[PDB]
Write an enzyme that holds these catalytic residues in place. Structure first.
Site, PDB file in Angstrom:
ATOM      1  N   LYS A  10       0.882  -1.152   0.000  1.00 16.63           N
ATOM      2  CA  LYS A  10       0.000   0.000   0.000  1.00 16.63           C
ATOM      3  C   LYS A  10       0.928   1.212   0.000  1.00 16.63           C
ATOM      4  O   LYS A  10       2.050   1.153   0.497  1.00 16.63           O
ATOM      5  CB  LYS A  10      -0.811  -0.053   1.299  1.00 16.63           C
ATOM      6  CG  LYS A  10      -1.314   1.196   1.822  1.00 16.63           C
ATOM      7  CD  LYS A  10      -1.719   1.011   3.251  1.00 16.63           C
ATOM      8  CE  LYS A  10      -2.109   2.317   3.914  1.00 16.63           C
ATOM      9  NZ  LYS A  10      -1.067   3.367   3.775  1.00 16.63           N
ATOM     10  N   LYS A  15       7.273   2.144   1.716  1.00 14.50           N
ATOM     11  CA  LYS A  15       7.666   0.948   0.982  1.00 14.50           C
ATOM     12  C   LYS A  15       8.869   1.126   0.089  1.00 14.50           C
ATOM     13  O   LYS A  15       9.778   0.290   0.099  1.00 14.50           O
ATOM     14  CB  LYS A  15       6.531   0.446   0.127  1.00 14.50           C
ATOM     15  CG  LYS A  15       6.967  -0.647  -0.817  1.00 14.50           C
ATOM     16  CD  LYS A  15       5.759  -1.236  -1.499  1.00 14.50           C
ATOM     17  CE  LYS A  15       5.186  -0.333  -2.577  1.00 14.50           C
ATOM     18  NZ  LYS A  15       5.985  -0.499  -3.800  1.00 14.50           N
ATOM     19  N   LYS A  41       3.670   7.743  -9.887  1.00 13.02           N
ATOM     20  CA  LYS A  41       4.473   8.855  -9.342  1.00 13.02           C
ATOM     21  C   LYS A  41       5.957   8.703  -9.649  1.00 13.02           C
ATOM     22  O   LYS A  41       6.672   9.693  -9.756  1.00 13.02           O
ATOM     23  CB  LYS A  41       4.303   8.941  -7.806  1.00 13.02           C
ATOM     24  CG  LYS A  41       5.365   9.796  -7.086  1.00 13.02           C
ATOM     25  CD  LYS A  41       5.421   9.543  -5.577  1.00 13.02           C
ATOM     26  CE  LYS A  41       6.575  10.315  -4.932  1.00 13.02           C
ATOM     27  NZ  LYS A  41       6.923   9.871  -3.543  1.00 13.02           N
ATOM     28  N   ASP A 129      -2.356  -0.477  -3.606  1.00 16.37           N
ATOM     29  CA  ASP A 129      -3.590   0.176  -3.259  1.00 16.37           C
ATOM     30  C   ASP A 129      -4.708  -0.374  -4.154  1.00 16.37           C
ATOM     31  O   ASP A 129      -5.868  -0.426  -3.740  1.00 16.37           O
ATOM     32  CB  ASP A 129      -3.411   1.664  -3.429  1.00 16.37           C
ATOM     33  CG  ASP A 129      -2.378   2.198  -2.483  1.00 16.37           C
ATOM     34  OD1 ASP A 129      -2.679   2.287  -1.283  1.00 16.37           O
ATOM     35  OD2 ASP A 129      -1.244   2.459  -2.915  1.00 16.37           O
TER      36      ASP A 129
END
Ligand code: SF4
Lengths: 289, 286
Positions: A10, A15, A41, A129
Site C-alpha cells: 500500500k 515501501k 508517481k 492500493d
C-alpha cells in the site's frame, strides 16, 4: 540464476524507501541489481540516483511516440552500487489502463534483454492500493516469482497484503509466483511487529523482517539517498543488511492462504488496533444510551 | 430534478464517513438521496444502514448465475432519513479492472428505474487512488455531473485530487461533468484548512468545507451510525449540515486547472508540510 522479485505494498508507509534501502544493502553485498519502479508517481529509484525524479518510459514514449525506442542511457540509468534504476511511469488519468506503463516497460526491457545483462536480482516496486489486472501484471505474466509484501500494523496495509496474497493464490498454478514473506515497516504502533507476525502465521508465510523507524532514514532521504550509502555505520543500516541476507537466503516461498474480513478484523481487535463493538448500543442515539 | 454527484478521493482519509454524514444531513434536511458505493471493499453505506456489510451487486451476480436474476429489493436497501443504498462491489483481486463493478451497478439501477423513483440526489462514493477504467467511469460515461473531491493536507491526497481533476478536464466536452469543490477531511494538521483553500483556489475551484476531526465521529461510527443520527446536537453535526447546505446551493461547477508537481510541492512547503530543499546536504550525505 537471476532472481526476479517484486515488493508490493500500500502506498504511504515507506515501501519504496525500504525497497531502495533493501536493494542498496544487496548492492553492497556485491549483488547485481535492477529496480523497475511500477509506480505512476515514480519514486522507486530516486534514492539510488540522488535524483529529484527519474524519466519514465511513458514520458519519453510520448517524445518519440513509439513504445520501443530508447536505448538504455535515457531510460535505464545505473546509480549507486551499480544498481540499474528504471521507471515505468503511468499513462494520463483516463487514458487506457494505468498498468500500461508497466506492461510496456517489461517487454521493452526484455527486448534489450536488460534482464540477461549481468544480473542477480530484479525488483519491481509496485503499489498495492489497487490489485487489478493492470497492477497484478508482473505476477500474472509470470514476470515476478518472489513476492515480498511491505505492510504496517494498520487496516488498509494489512488489507492490501491480503489482496496481494489473493492475487498470488490465483496464479500459483499457472506459474511459479510465490510469497516470500511480509516486511513490516514500523509506523510506531504498539504490538505492530507481533500483529504482523500473527498475520504472517495466519497467511501461512513469515514476517521476514521488522524495519524500525529511525530518523536517519528521513535524514538520508533528504539527501536523496539510502541509509546504506549515507552512513553505512548506522544502526538502521544493519537492519537492511539483515533483511537483505534473509532475502538472499530465503528458502520459504509459499502459496498464501488468505483470510476473511472477520479473521482480519479479529486480528486487528486482539492487538488493540480495532475497537470491539458493543452490540447492544448499535443504532442507539447518544441520548438513548 | 435529480442531481447526480460523486464524491471522489484517495482511500484511507475518512471519505466514506464524510459522504454518509453529508448524505444524512441532506436527508435530515428533507432530501431524498441514494448512495451508490463504488469501493470494491464496500464501506460506503454501513452508517446509514447500521449494518455489518451490505451485500454487493457483484457478490450477488456471482450467485444466481448473472445480474439478470437479481432483484432490486435485494440490491437496494433504505436506512436513516430514507436514504437508499447500494454497493457495486468489485471483481476478485488481480482479475481485470478493480473498479468495474460500477458499470454493473449503474446499468442495473438503470434497467430497474431506480433513478426515477423519488430521488433528489445520487452520490456515487468512488475511490480515486487511480483514475482509469471503472474508477473513471462515472465521469467518462457522464453518470455524475457534480464532482466533490475529499482530500486532506497530505501529498498523496492532494495528488489524487489533481489527477481526478485531470480526469474531468479530459472529459470536458464529453458531457457536463464538472468539479464542484474540494472537501477537506482534517487530519488535525496545522493550517490544514488554509492549505486546501490554497489548492482549491489554484485549481479554479473552492474548498467547499473543512471537516474537523472530532471524537464524536468515532463514537458515532463504533455504533454503525452517522453523527447526524447519533448526536444531532453535536458541534460536528452542524459541520456536516453546513457542507450539505453549500453542496445543495452550490453554483460553482467548473473545468479545473490541474497544477504541476512543483506547484503541489510549493503549497506543501509554503504551508508547513514539506521542508525546503537544503542543498549542500544532497547527493553526498555523510
Ligand atoms: S485494471 Fe487497474 S490499472 Fe487498469 S484501468 Fe482498471 S483499475 Fe486501472
Amino acid at each position: 540464476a537471476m532472481r526476479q522479485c517484486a515488493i508490493y505494498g500500500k502506498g504511504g508507509i515507506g515501501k519504496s524507501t525500504t525497497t531502495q534501502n533493501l536493494v542498496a544493502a544487496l548492492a553492497e553485498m556485491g549483488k547485481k541489481v535492477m529496480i523497475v519502479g511500477c509506480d505512476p508517481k515514480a519514486d522507486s529509484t530516486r534514492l539510488i540516483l540522488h535524483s529529484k525524479a527519474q524519466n519514465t518510459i511513458m514520458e519519453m514514449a510520448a517524445e518519440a511516440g513509439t513504445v520501443e525506442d530508447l536505448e538504455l542511457e535515457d531510460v535505464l540509468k545505473a546509480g549507486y552500487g551499480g544498481v540499474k534504476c528504471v521507471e515505468s511511469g503511468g499513462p494520463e488519468p483516463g487514458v487506457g489502463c494505468a498498468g500500461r506503463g508497466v506492461i510496456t516497460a517489461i517487454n521493452f526491457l526484455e527486448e534489450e534483454g536488460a534482464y540477461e545483462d549481468d544480473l542477480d536480482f530484479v525488483f519491481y516496486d509496485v503499489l498495492g492500493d489497487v490489485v487489478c489486472g493492470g497492477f497484478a501484471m508482473p505476477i500474472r505474466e509470470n514476470k515476478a516469482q518472489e513476492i515480498y509484501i511491505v505492510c504496517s500494523g494498520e487496516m488498509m496495509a494489512m488489507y492490501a497484503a491480503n489482496n496481494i496474497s489473493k492475487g498470488i493464490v490465483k496464479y500459483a498454478n499457472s506459474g511459479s509466483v510465490r510469497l516470500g514473506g511480509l516486511i513490516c515497516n514500523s509506523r510506531n504502533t504498539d504490538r505492530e511487529d507481533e500483529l504482523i507476525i500473527a498475520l504472517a502465521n495466519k497467511l501461512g508465510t513469515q514476517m521476514i523482517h521488522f524495519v524500525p523507524r529511525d530518523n536517519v532514514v528521513q535524514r538520508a532521504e533528504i539527501r536523496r539517498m539510502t541509509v546504506i550509502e549515507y552512513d553505512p555505520k548506522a544502526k538502521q543500516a544493519d537492519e537492511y543488511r539483515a533483511l537483505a541476507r534473509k532475502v538472499v537466503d530465503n528458502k520459504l516461498l509459499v502459496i498464501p492462504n488468505p483470510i476473511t474480513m472477520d479473521e482480519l478484523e479479529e486480528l486487528l481487535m486482539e492487538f488493540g488496533i480495532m475497537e470491539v463493538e458493543d452490540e447492544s448500543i448499535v443504532g442507539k442515539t447518544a441520548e438513548e444510551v
